[PDB]
Amino acid sequence: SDPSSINGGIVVAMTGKDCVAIACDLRLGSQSLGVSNKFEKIFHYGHVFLGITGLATDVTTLNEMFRYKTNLYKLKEERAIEPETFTQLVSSSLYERRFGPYFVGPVVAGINSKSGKPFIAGFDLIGCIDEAKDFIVSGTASDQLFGMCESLYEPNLEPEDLFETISQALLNAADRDALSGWGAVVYIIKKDEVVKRYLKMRQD
């Protein structure tokens, strides 16, 4: 009944030293029924990464919408959109549906190509920006993720240390949530290389 917890799923993003990480589970369900273990919730438009939790039809719709908009942006601006600018675009786009919203919990992650500064941001379903320095969490196990991140996180982690932190944050949060899990992906993002890692986890 609650649109934000029909399909389930989680996204978490973290900042490190000259790097950001964004991670998500792979589950899509119809309440109790597991439907897909390959439903990735992280997308990218150039070097800007967007994770989206919540109602799966809206996740798909918004990805297509932001691909649409960032493609036109690039053709007109003659450059790839930056994380700070894209964050405002997500906020604008969500709030235009103020009284008929997309039931989603978006998370932006990326590195500004000009300043080199790591950037993360979160949103409620209606566009309010949470621009945290440390970490952003979203999804049906957001409480669990908040608990994991708050204790596990420390600032200025190196890319390969940040990977372990965000992975353990996701995995242990997901294992305490019925509607999250069934696989997981972690993106480690540096200024001009991005590594994608699929994690091994329990399949119940």
């Binding site: 992975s167 353990q168 290389e193």
Partner: protein, 226 residues
């Protein structure tokens, strides 16, 4: 949320806490609640956070165009009139509760505005879940002809009352001082009385702790030449 506004000798000061919550969970521990409508007109918002931000940016945008059109610096009464007529039209569905303060060629001003579109004038005001704690402090220590230093002290004390006593409020105190014939000075994290103590343990993992199935390079670059 605890937000206050206090009039003084030659201007007005607004202040706010820095906790934003979803239910009982703290989403952001250092939220910026002091929004700029124009260089010398600032407001603070309680209620639906997206609505307070959105309504501020919209009126701020229209205020800027109005300023350019009229070749005059924006007035607080214009911001107030535009905010209230917008909010009234939506009959409280835009959940923006604001304290609007600023200086303009007419003088210094302090107003509160409520989601349904009603407005109020005052020398001291408080809004949000910690407004009763804040108003207790304001009603105990406010006087006529406050100095700039006294008003900043009173405002931040009122926010502290919210921080310590209201569960909806916490973390830091932000302040903005708008004085007549001066630049508005935004004092982000004016007080920081809630720094987390060092943890008992480091939770940095050994590398290779997490089990990995696959690795791959993600192509973020555009289609290459040659």
């Amino acid at each position: 949320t605890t937000i206050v506004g206090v009039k003084f000798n030659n201007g007005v000061v607004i202040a706010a806490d820095t906790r934003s919550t979803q239910g009982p969970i703290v989403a952001d521990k250092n939220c910026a609640k002091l929004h700029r409508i124009s260089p010398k007109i600032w407001c603070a918002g309680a209620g639906t956070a997206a609505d307070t931000e959105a309504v501020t940016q919209l009126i701020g945008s229209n205020i800027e165009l109005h300023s350019l059109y009229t070749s005059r610096e924006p007035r607080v009464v214009s911001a107030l009139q535009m905010l209230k007529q917008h909010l009234f039209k939506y009959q409280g569905h835009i959940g923006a509760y604001l304290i609007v303060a600023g200086v303009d060629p007419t003088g210094s001003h302090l107003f509160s505005i409520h989601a349904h579109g009603s407005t109020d004038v005052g020398y001291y005001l408080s809004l949000g879940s910690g407004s009763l704690a804040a108003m207790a402090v304001l009603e105990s220590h406010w006087k006529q002809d406050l100095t700039k230093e006294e008003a900043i002290k009173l405002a931040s004390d009122a926010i502290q009352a919210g921080i310590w006593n209201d569960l909806g409020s916490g973390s830091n105190v932000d302040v903005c001082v708008m004085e007549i014939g001066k630049d508005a000075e935004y004092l982000r994290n004016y007080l920081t009385p809630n720094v987390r103590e060092e943890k008992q343990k480091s939770y940095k993992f050994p590398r290779g702790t997490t089990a990995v199935l696959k690795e791959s390079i993600v192509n973020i670059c555009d289609i290459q030449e040659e």
